[PDB]
């Protein structure tokens, strides 16, 4: 049960508030027992000598004894649950942040193991099952323990045997039942958690791609498998309900046995006298009422077969090391940046063949180069290595005659801007979907930069307060590319990485975009990865096939002269 | 959420108990039997105690009632077990049925209505909102009659001994409903607001998780934490707000029950002493009546507290039923769901006059299109970006709502029995994604029983087997989350192979040569031309080279078509087409 230890240590910040709960619990349990015990004893003892000889003075037992037990029984309970709950959620939310932080600094190959449909389950629905741990696990046990000892010690003053019998029966039940009801709950909770995660993942995967499923008629199979994986979850829930019902029945039977034993045994005298009188009533009533405190003890321990699984999942999620690591206080931004790649060798994880070997290049003080290649040749892998996603397994990647590693996250992520070939539309306001580049900016530069790229149709009607992405307006296939280009010019930066502009645009729009890009980027350095051989007047042309530079021409002229590669690339094959 | 909305939601929730009233009746009967048994036990215990205390009679003469008390206890335990099991089963059945209905409607909806909310919101609505009605459907409904029935029997059994205690209980009884109806509405509204906040949080988290690459490359590692913190605070506040009302109601009920118990005990204690002597049937008061009343009163009050506890579960169910009821009353694309089959084979012909394709909100994405594709042939759409070509393809597929046009073979497209209609299409899509797990399953998504034509399909579209002897396993490679195992240009060929496996009668080709080099695009184009020559096609190609023998060219922009001609007659002075071709040829 060591999986529950780290999450049980979150008491150093809310110790007093949670301890007040257990104090109030023992107080209200004591009041609840005392009310019935005193009422029974008064009703029994007012009838023996109450007919004549009114010497049992009246105005102490009902007034002080009972009216003081009808308030504490209620006011004790209401303040007990109102405080503790307030603490518990105040912890849970904190966890919901902490895990999220540990999920941030691993985008590539880090979260590629876990399916993205169940990480949401771990974050949301697997942190809401610890409220049982923070509410029911601790307080009932100590409350029942203290109440049982207090009652037994109080009753031991008269006829040790009876009080010892009652206390022993209560202690035996308390120490026996939870260890016996933990067992089946273990397996049932494990199945519950696993099946809930699987069902959520499958349901999420069923959507986000309904179009292809429904066009090709492949939805009935997935629906059938969804129902199949839900049936077992329902069955396990039924098993849990059955176990709970059996627990309640056993509690009732134990209470009946205790009541019967205490009633029958207290006949020959509860302490001498061979005929007690008015004491059997209190002894019966105390046993009758004492088990309402012990009733909820087993429901707290039975449900520990589900909390452990969630704790294990969260612990696994929060204990993964990163793969990059950053230095400190090395920002020192500049205006002119060069680039040097002496040797680069990379092998993707879990793979066995190098996807990028033997690459060397040098870009000097704001050049303009474009690289060409086959459909698959590791050209987008080269770009993603310059933003420190993975770590090269050989060679060096210099930057302005300085190692890339000796640069903190506030600098490498500042003088680098990228335009990836897979754009994402965040479900947020257009003003918030475009302020990622430059958070400060203004509300006027946004319109100006949105008008030159050529959109001119989004800042209308509602305008910059419209809701884009899912749940709102969805952009087309070219507007997405234009928006990706637009949120790469506000960021500025002296080094731009255009992964693949103009993929899904017509001739006129692409021409306008090319003219704009050429005009605005003049003092910077551009590394283009293009498939259209359109307007190649750059200062360096580079071609790749599998790993290395086939020809580093850099003039666009001798390729038309030397009948090598790129000579057949544009004529046709 | 006004009073009328709550009434409508309550009626809708009550509608679904028809298939479980059969077990609700059994639950009510079992509760009634338990209520009888507990009274019997109380009477037995009271008689035993009076005989034991007053007359000092030895145990042996009271050997009879002990066995009856034991039997009553055993019977009570058995009854409670059976009642709990029956209640749970009756609760589960209705949730199963409701989830089946919701999934059916969601499948019938389509891909345009699904994007109305993020997938996280859909998952939360399907799981939590459906699962949170179990308490209402299992506990509250049987208890609504038990809380009326059992106290009446208890007070009736108490009556024939001393009317004062019964009068006290009857006077104390009516106060509870007046004090739960004062917080019911607040609970019912707070529940809905809390559920809305939870759905918002889940959707935000899922959407942020999907696009982590942009956040990393742009360095936004601080604002997202702030947004998550705000969402968590908004969730926590509503949760505390509903729990506070629940606690207050429970405390008030407990206080009143305790006060009534104290009053009854005080009266019975004072009566024996000869101080009050007002309530009796002129025969005094005995210990048996007092003990019986003392034992029975808390059990008289318990069902009312149970009803007060289950009222908040009912409020939770009412609040949860607000989000999934509105969605179940929103019109779909075509609100008829027609029924007709357009035979088989019989080469198609798409003809439309004045077709205005709308949006799932009410906007307009097209204009007065007038066209007719005669008995096969091939059609290409070329024009300025942002005109509505993909909207036309979606309307032809059947994911949007049109207005009075687009009939095929003389039959309107509105009543073609969608399940039968979608069998004649071989979609290719723009920016495709792989929804399966293994690379072999995606290429076999149409006809999953074939092992020889798979190789021919993978070799005809070509260049999908060129990278096959490079993956770790082979044709059974477990592709990544979206497409992480493959690149961008290697998924287009997979989609093309998927679209070319089996014959069809209508081929809606989106842009097939996306992110491809010259050789690969040329081979895929040759394969697609060979496949397309055999039946009706519709292409939205974006390059103005090699279209000399495509039979028809439709230049379209601003959501309408101006020029519908041929390559020879449109390459001389054909307005916008000439300008586009000139730009394309001069830029090279
Ligand atoms: N996440 C990944 N894990 C392992 N291998 C990968 C991953 N992503 C891509 N690859 C491998 O990288 C190789 C191609 O590299 P990359 O994806 O950079 O291609 P590319 O030439 O940039 O393609 P494109 O021009 O279409 O962008 C292939 O062998 C592919 O399987
Ligand atoms: N549901 C919608 N709500 C609002 N606007 C929409 C919706 N769907 C499409 N649009 C808008 O319709 C316009 C053009 O329609 P559509 O999206 O079909 O463009 P398109 O012709 O397919 O463009 P392209 O093929 O060049 O990417 C765009 O401005 C797009 O944002």
Author numbering:
A (entry chain C): 1 to 573
B (entry chain A): 1 to 588
Reported in the publication:
In the ATP-bound structures, the two axial His residues are 12.9 Å far away from each other in MsCydDC (or 12.7 Å in EcCydDC). (iv) ATP molecules bind to the NBDs of both subunits and induce their dimerization. The two axial His residues move apart to release heme into the cavity.
TM4 and TM5 of one subunit associate with TM1-3 and TM6 of another to form a helix bundle in a “domain swapping” manner.
